[PDB]
Amino acid sequence: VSVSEIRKAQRAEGPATILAIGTANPANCVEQSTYPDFYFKITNSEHKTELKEKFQRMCDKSMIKRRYMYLTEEILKENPNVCEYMAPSLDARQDMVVVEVPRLGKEAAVKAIKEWGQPKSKITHLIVCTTSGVDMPGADYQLTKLLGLRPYVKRYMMYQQGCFAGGTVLRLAKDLAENNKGARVLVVCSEVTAVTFRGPSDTHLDSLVGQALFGDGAAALIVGSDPVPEIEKPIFEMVWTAQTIAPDSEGAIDFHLREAGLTFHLLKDVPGIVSKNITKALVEAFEPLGISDYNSIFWIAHPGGPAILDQVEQKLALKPEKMNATREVLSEYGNMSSACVLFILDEMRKKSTQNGLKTTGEGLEWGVLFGFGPGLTIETVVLRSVAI
Template identity: 50%
Template sequence: MGAAAQPATVLNELRRAQRADGPAAVLAIGTAVPANCVRQDDFTDWYFRVTKSDHLTELKAKMKRMCDKSGIKKRYFHHTEEMIGGHPELLDRAAPSLGARLRISADAVPELAAAAAERAIAEWGRQAADITHLVVTTNSGGNEPGADLRLARLLGLRPTVRRTLLYLHGCSASFIAIRLAKDIAENNRGARVLVACAHSTILPFGAPDEAQLDALVAMAIFGDGAGAAIVGADPTNPVERPIFHIASSSQATLPGTEHAVAINLGEGGVRYRMSAEVPELVRSNIERCLVDSLAPLGQAAASGCGWNGPFWAVHPGSRPLLDSYEAALGLETGKLAASRRVLSEYGNMLAATIIFVLHEMRRRRQDGEKEGEESQWGIMSTLGPGLTIETIVLQASGDRNDG
């Protein structure tokens, strides 16, 4: 029995030695957008001009109303009027265009991700070569080798960096990536995980079509951008300074809602399906999902103030979605201020957007603004295809100037 037990004892000791002592934390954040900026007030005219669709006057008026109600002031795009003009296949539904879209994205996505990652690494204070793991997410690709390998080369990461590439997870991809980064950091002593989320809306870009109103909604709210975060446990003082500790993560799929949000890759690029009932699904289900997500934490994240106790980093998928969170949870005006500001300044950049929200939340904490000043615990939330609700519980660093 003693001889048989010895290997198990060795394995247990090895396992303990491999694990970190403390919880994972976000150690640095970086964001980036392309140079081409289009104001939302001008977008409808710009979009119908570059797609040669000015004759569709009723559809143009419909998009104008969407843009006016979106809560967005401006968005950024890798594609320009000149680029669209040079690729007529992007506007011809009868012509296969996936190859052209993927070639454009193959350059745009890693370069945009590198810009955000370089800012995160500079803030982190250590060398890029100290990154041990790389998790990249994008809706704008389908190649292998993909954006992860190109990004690793652009940043000068070691050839031994362990890479993971996630495609087509929509707005929830960053939550999946951070969840994965948490597990890696806590189960591999000394691991430093670079999470990079980058998107270029050239894949869903196309001419307006009355029969595809979902595509029109996507054109009215989506923008290009990249967000990066470095995640690790047991920070090395004084160089590494945690911004947010990652307490837990969870996922819940609402039965019978597969039709509500979907992403499909085809010869004409990416098509998004977003049902008009999504805001109501959020109002009906979000509180139950949050209660289930927080239950394993017991009273640790409770503040005695109900849902207004924590700070909130909600993915700003759209203005109606943010309104649904507020209505369902009884949130005070201003609790979603960080999310609304990011939506206003950048639009919905899919998975990258939540990194911008964390960046904005951190700024507000440093400046002593109300949303960050009162709360130590916070909740990140988003929706994904399924319909899936992702939740991550954060604990903010005790010192607002950390990170």
Template identity: 45%
Template sequence: MATTSHVTVYDIRRAQRADTTAAVLAIGTANPVTCISQADYPDYYFRITNTEHLTDLKRKLNNLCQASGADKRFFHHNEEMIAAHPEFLDRATPSLDARLDIAAAAGPELAAQAAERAIVRWGRPAADITHLVVATNAGAQAPGADHRLASLLGLRPTVRRTMLHLSGCSAGAAALRLAKDLAENSRGARVLVACVELNVVAFHGPKEDYPQTLTCQGLFGDGAGVVIVGADAVRPVERPLFEMVAVSQAVIPGTEHALNMRLTEHGLDGHVSIKDLIPLAAANADELLSDAFRQLGLAGVEWNDLFWVVHPGAPSILDQIESALRLEPGKLAASRKVLREYGNMLGSMLIFVLDEQRRRMEEEEGGRSAEWGVMMGFGPGFTIETMVLHLPECPKEQ
């Protein structure tokens, strides 16, 4: 076939790809208005579920709340909502439709609050967003939260949308891993990653023969985190915060029992074994991180020379990671602070930790106590997501 051009597919492919590594360009977070302290939560929970006579279970929930590492948590569901939906309390009564309807309306609105804050910090108009990745454990519709969020933000009809469902606490890391690939393989792409969690889909009344309920009710809270990701930053408008250098995902064989989840007729259900989870992340962190840096030609990295963005599922998990990697006190301070102030917000949690780490580094004298860092997220499987981060060099003044 005759052609008038000498352009090859390779030339086209090279022109389609970004020149630089993807970077975090802006972060925004948001929470619902209802806030309950962990000290008050057992009384609150047993009152609104009309089960104050279950004193033994209340004592167990109180102990769990005290050990959770959280001072308070935020929720979209409140006492009035639970009173209007008594089916949420009874596992024998189907309630999934009602739960999903609530989440379908409230989830995108909460994500939009976080997104609007990120867009303001980014400095460019929302219409410049080319890709949208939404992760949630509180949705199962199409069109879903991505479609509604795009409408709320005024994104272009051509924005390329992707939904991630039921990735548990690793949703934030998984969504950022996808955003890195999109940004680096689509020149000029600007990817808005939104992770939003609403535990109304998993709220249940206590059952004496199903203690797993108390674990979920005592740990998880609601929140939304948004990150804008892009390569080839447009100076001086865009200011890269973290370069996303390399990513990996590993499933630890034979651990499916430790953490799993599923949608059922009575809402989101599953199994969380804190006892089994505590050693898993710590036992595998050194090998996985060493392999990640080795592949970059950076063997022999000292863990205490890095900054850390770790999903804080529970204080005991962080303690084990600190011990296994011999981390100095304070290396996981950002994770501990977010856990203390919000509880475990599942997939959105890691974005809150990333934002807290950003804030801490900007407040430090010089702002660059560590050049390299790592992000770790944990989810069903048992799955460990890792990302190697790097602080961008400050551009020289012209």
């Protein structure tokens, strides 16, 4: 028995390719314009006038028009510990998200599998990614059961990853699809803010920022190498990936899982760290490709907050349109953590196709997707678009 014969026959041939994208959000749509009034009332903080005004300026600066939240006024009224800034509430929050993550994930996955059009039994690997809650068996096992995947699907349960993990799940699905002939990877990012929602505190203005930004949603992909011509439909190709930790950024973004739920802290200037280190990431990715004009590639960036986007645009002298799809997703859904960049890929490919452009990457060939989050970590994914 030859291990090299087995290895050759086992592996796929071409680049890992995105073949379908499906998204989903909780039904409750929350307008940002009236959020400050709603939030300060539901957390019983209507007396904190100076703090409410501060929040109002945060929401107004957010560039977020609306968010979808599983949390409702009725749920919050049954959980006063959730509405305080710091009250023992993990068990309640966990009971919401252990169900809502996989539920929401299932709606996005069903849509992606419908688009792909192939039997669900051809799904050989499943990657599930959430920052909301944890359980054993995890959300990967719950989604295997809910969707009726084969019990031998190969699972990768990525918990407590944070905002930057839309990048991580592509970097992982790339290697699973490329290394294994026939592999078809379902990828599901599903993020629900019930573990981070909390009352306001004037000594914790970073925590308050998270209340203006974070929203819910789930996105699902089908990733595979060697698509079957005219049966499967490539959308984007992944070519190269990287993950790095920016210098001078220790403690920049932290989240702790405690008895009071998932806390959020911002100790450094994120927009300034990301914009100071984005050029280095682009040169690593693009220099080996002979490309140095960053307006000549299509862009996907995790919209941690609008300032990250403005500062990256300013630093590199991106034309205002480069961030359009990214900003459109921030405007319609807010910061959905790991799911955001996947929604941004969906928006771009849908707009490109609806608008009759020549490729799924806004008529351009090469593209870049970035994930930003705790560390301070930067994930990079180099993509190629597909004609039509």
